[PDB]
Amino acid sequence: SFSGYLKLTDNVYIKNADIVEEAKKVKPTVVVNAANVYLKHGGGVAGALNKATNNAMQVESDDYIATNGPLKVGGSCVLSGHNLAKHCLHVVGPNVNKGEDIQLLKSAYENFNQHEVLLAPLLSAGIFGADPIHSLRVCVDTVRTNVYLAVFDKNLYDKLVSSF
What we know:
- It contains 6 helices and 7 strands; from the N terminus they run ββαβααββαβαβα.
- By secondary structure, the chain is an alpha/beta fold.
- The chain has one domain (1-164).
- A hairpin with a 6-residue loop joins β4 and β5 (87-92).
- α4 crosses α5 (132-142).
- The two termini are 25 Å apart.
- It catalyses: Thiol-dependent hydrolysis of ester, thioester, amide, peptide and isopeptide bonds formed by the C-terminal Gly of ubiquitin (a 76-residue protein attached to proteins as an intracellular targeting signal).
- It is found in: Host endoplasmic reticulum membrane.
Protein backbone atom coordinates (compact mmCIF):
# COMPACT_ATOMS: atom_id res chain seq x y z
CA SER A 1 0.00 0.00 0.00
CA PHE A 2 1.03 3.73 0.51
CA SER A 3 4.41 4.32 2.15
CA GLY A 4 6.46 7.27 3.33
CA TYR A 5 3.50 9.58 3.98
CA LEU A 6 3.34 12.18 6.74
CA LYS A 7 -0.05 11.98 8.61
CA LEU A 8 -1.71 15.46 8.71
CA THR A 9 -5.12 14.48 10.15
CA ASP A 10 -7.24 11.28 10.88
CA ASN A 11 -7.69 10.84 7.07
CA VAL A 12 -5.30 13.18 5.20
CA TYR A 13 -1.71 12.07 4.40
CA ILE A 14 0.99 13.87 2.39
CA LYS A 15 4.22 12.92 0.55
CA ASN A 16 6.75 14.76 -1.64
CA ALA A 17 6.34 12.57 -4.70
CA ASP A 18 5.59 12.51 -8.40
CA ILE A 19 1.95 11.33 -8.54
CA VAL A 20 2.72 9.33 -11.75
CA GLU A 21 5.55 7.43 -10.06
CA GLU A 22 3.39 7.02 -6.98
CA ALA A 23 0.49 5.62 -9.04
CA LYS A 24 2.79 3.18 -10.90
CA LYS A 25 4.20 1.88 -7.64
CA VAL A 26 0.96 1.62 -5.64
CA LYS A 27 -1.55 1.06 -8.46
CA PRO A 28 -4.27 2.54 -6.17
CA THR A 29 -8.01 1.95 -6.63
CA VAL A 30 -8.37 5.66 -7.45
CA VAL A 31 -5.92 8.22 -8.76
CA VAL A 32 -7.29 11.79 -8.93
CA ASN A 33 -6.52 13.86 -11.99
CA ALA A 34 -6.40 17.68 -11.85
CA ALA A 35 -8.71 17.92 -14.82
CA ASN A 36 -10.28 20.80 -16.76
CA VAL A 37 -13.97 20.79 -17.94
CA TYR A 38 -12.96 19.56 -21.40
CA LEU A 39 -10.75 16.72 -20.12
CA LYS A 40 -7.93 18.17 -22.28
CA HIS A 41 -4.88 16.74 -20.42
CA GLY A 42 -2.25 19.12 -21.75
CA GLY A 43 -0.12 20.17 -18.81
CA GLY A 44 0.51 19.89 -15.08
CA VAL A 45 -0.69 16.73 -13.36
CA ALA A 46 -3.17 15.99 -16.23
CA GLY A 47 -0.50 16.11 -18.91
CA ALA A 48 1.81 13.95 -16.83
CA LEU A 49 -0.86 11.32 -16.03
CA ASN A 50 -2.03 11.25 -19.66
CA LYS A 51 1.57 10.88 -20.98
CA ALA A 52 2.08 7.91 -18.57
CA THR A 53 -0.96 6.19 -20.17
CA ASN A 54 0.57 6.63 -23.69
CA ASN A 55 -2.37 9.01 -24.47
CA ALA A 56 -4.99 6.29 -23.70
CA MET A 57 -6.44 8.61 -21.02
CA GLN A 58 -6.94 11.41 -23.62
CA VAL A 59 -8.54 9.01 -26.17
CA GLU A 60 -10.95 7.76 -23.52
CA SER A 61 -11.62 11.33 -22.31
CA ASP A 62 -12.41 12.63 -25.82
CA ASP A 63 -14.99 9.84 -26.24
CA TYR A 64 -16.45 10.75 -22.80
CA ILE A 65 -16.73 14.45 -23.80
CA ALA A 66 -18.21 13.60 -27.23
CA THR A 67 -20.98 11.65 -25.44
CA ASN A 68 -21.53 13.76 -22.32
CA GLY A 69 -20.28 17.26 -22.94
CA PRO A 70 -17.99 19.12 -20.58
CA LEU A 71 -17.83 18.67 -16.83
CA LYS A 72 -18.79 21.52 -14.48
CA VAL A 73 -16.07 23.42 -12.56
CA GLY A 74 -16.23 21.66 -9.15
CA GLY A 75 -17.45 18.45 -10.78
CA SER A 76 -15.93 15.11 -11.63
CA CYS A 77 -16.21 11.91 -13.58
CA VAL A 78 -14.84 8.42 -13.03
CA LEU A 79 -12.94 6.94 -15.95
CA SER A 80 -10.35 4.12 -16.30
CA GLY A 81 -7.09 4.40 -14.41
CA HIS A 82 -5.32 2.63 -17.34
CA ASN A 83 -1.80 1.49 -16.20
CA LEU A 84 -1.86 3.90 -13.20
CA ALA A 85 -4.86 2.88 -11.09
CA LYS A 86 -8.12 0.85 -11.28
CA HIS A 87 -9.96 4.21 -11.80
CA CYS A 88 -9.12 7.83 -12.47
CA LEU A 89 -11.35 10.37 -10.78
CA HIS A 90 -11.07 13.44 -13.01
CA VAL A 91 -11.84 16.38 -10.73
CA VAL A 92 -12.19 19.98 -11.93
CA GLY A 93 -10.94 22.49 -9.43
CA PRO A 94 -11.40 26.21 -10.23
CA ASN A 95 -8.61 27.68 -12.36
CA VAL A 96 -7.83 31.06 -10.77
CA ASN A 97 -5.83 31.94 -13.96
CA LYS A 98 -9.26 31.91 -15.83
CA GLY A 99 -11.17 33.95 -13.13
CA GLU A 100 -13.03 30.89 -11.78
CA ASP A 101 -14.66 31.15 -8.33
CA ILE A 102 -12.18 29.82 -5.66
CA GLN A 103 -15.24 28.87 -3.49
CA LEU A 104 -15.75 26.02 -6.05
CA LEU A 105 -12.62 24.37 -4.57
CA LYS A 106 -14.71 22.97 -1.69
CA SER A 107 -17.22 21.49 -4.20
CA ALA A 108 -14.32 19.98 -6.14
CA TYR A 109 -12.93 18.26 -2.99
CA GLU A 110 -16.42 16.93 -2.11
CA ASN A 111 -16.05 14.54 -5.06
CA PHE A 112 -13.31 12.71 -3.09
CA ASN A 113 -15.92 11.66 -0.47
CA GLN A 114 -17.45 9.19 -2.93
CA HIS A 115 -14.23 7.06 -2.74
CA GLU A 116 -12.91 5.31 0.41
CA VAL A 117 -9.26 5.89 -0.50
CA LEU A 118 -7.58 8.07 -3.13
CA LEU A 119 -4.13 9.05 -4.37
CA ALA A 120 -4.47 12.78 -5.26
CA PRO A 121 -2.80 16.05 -6.07
CA LEU A 122 -3.75 19.36 -4.35
CA LEU A 123 -6.71 20.67 -6.36
CA SER A 124 -6.35 24.04 -8.11
CA ALA A 125 -2.65 24.18 -7.15
CA GLY A 126 0.20 24.46 -9.73
CA ILE A 127 -0.84 25.77 -13.11
CA PHE A 128 -4.45 26.21 -11.83
CA GLY A 129 -3.20 29.26 -9.90
CA ALA A 130 -4.66 28.84 -6.41
CA ASP A 131 -2.62 29.07 -3.21
CA PRO A 132 -1.60 25.44 -2.36
CA ILE A 133 -1.70 26.22 1.41
CA HIS A 134 -5.39 27.21 0.96
CA SER A 135 -6.01 24.05 -1.15
CA LEU A 136 -4.58 21.80 1.59
CA ARG A 137 -6.77 23.60 4.18
CA VAL A 138 -9.90 23.05 2.03
CA CYS A 139 -8.87 19.42 1.50
CA VAL A 140 -8.53 18.70 5.24
CA ASP A 141 -11.79 20.56 6.05
CA THR A 142 -13.80 18.85 3.26
CA VAL A 143 -12.50 15.33 2.54
CA ARG A 144 -13.61 12.70 5.08
CA THR A 145 -12.31 9.65 3.16
CA ASN A 146 -8.62 8.55 3.13
CA VAL A 147 -6.67 10.91 0.87
CA TYR A 148 -2.97 10.43 0.09
CA LEU A 149 -1.66 13.68 -1.33
CA ALA A 150 1.35 13.68 -3.64
CA VAL A 151 3.12 17.09 -3.84
CA PHE A 152 5.67 17.11 -6.65
CA ASP A 153 7.61 20.22 -5.60
CA LYS A 154 9.94 19.58 -2.52
CA ASN A 155 10.07 23.26 -1.52
CA LEU A 156 6.26 23.50 -1.66
CA TYR A 157 5.93 20.16 0.26
CA ASP A 158 8.16 21.60 3.06
CA LYS A 159 6.20 24.88 3.13
CA LEU A 160 2.87 22.96 3.29
CA VAL A 161 4.03 20.71 6.19
CA SER A 162 5.77 23.50 8.17
CA SER A 163 2.74 25.85 7.92
CA PHE A 164 -0.01 23.23 8.53
